[PDB]
């Protein structure tokens, strides 16, 4: 395919952080406070939200969904 430029290089600790458009009540899963930004990041596998710069303190993407999955025996 013509997509000979796959920028598959956006993994800090296993989570895929994609740019979102925070326009409402949002909280930084890395700074435990309200994201007053117009852009944030989300892991499609652990459903976190961060200030689009606090991803270098988020745990491995199998140590985030171990707190962000309300359908697991997390006890």
Stretch that binds Zn ion, among 1-9, 19-27, 52-60 (CB under 5 A): 52-60
Identify whether the C-beta of residue 51 lies closer than 8 Å to the C-beta of residue 7: no
Task: Determine which residue in the list 28, 40, 41, 42 makes contact with Zn ion, applying CB under 5 A.
Answer: 28
Task: Determine which residue in the list 22, 49, 51, 55 makes contact with Zn ion, applying CB under 5 A.
Answer: 51
With binding defined as CB under 5 A, does residue 55 bind Zn ion?
Answer: no
Quote the CA–CA distance of 34 and 45 in Å, as a whole number. 21
Tokens of 51: 């200030």
Identify whether the C-beta of residue 17 lies closer than 8 Å to the C-beta of residue 55: yes
Applying CB under 5 A, the residues found at the interface with Zn ion are 15, 28, 30-31, 43, 45-46, 51, 54, 61, 64
């Amino acid at each position: 395919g013509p997509m000979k430029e796959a920028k598959d290089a956006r993994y800090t600790n296993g989570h895929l952080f994609t740019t979102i458009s925070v326009s409402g009540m949002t909280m930084c899963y890395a700074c435990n406070k309200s994201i007053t930004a117009k852009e944030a990041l989300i892991c499609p596998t652990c459903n976190v939200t961060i200030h689009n710069r606090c991803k270098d303190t988020l745990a491995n993407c199998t140590k985030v969904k171990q707190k962000q999955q309300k359908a697991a025996l997390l006890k």
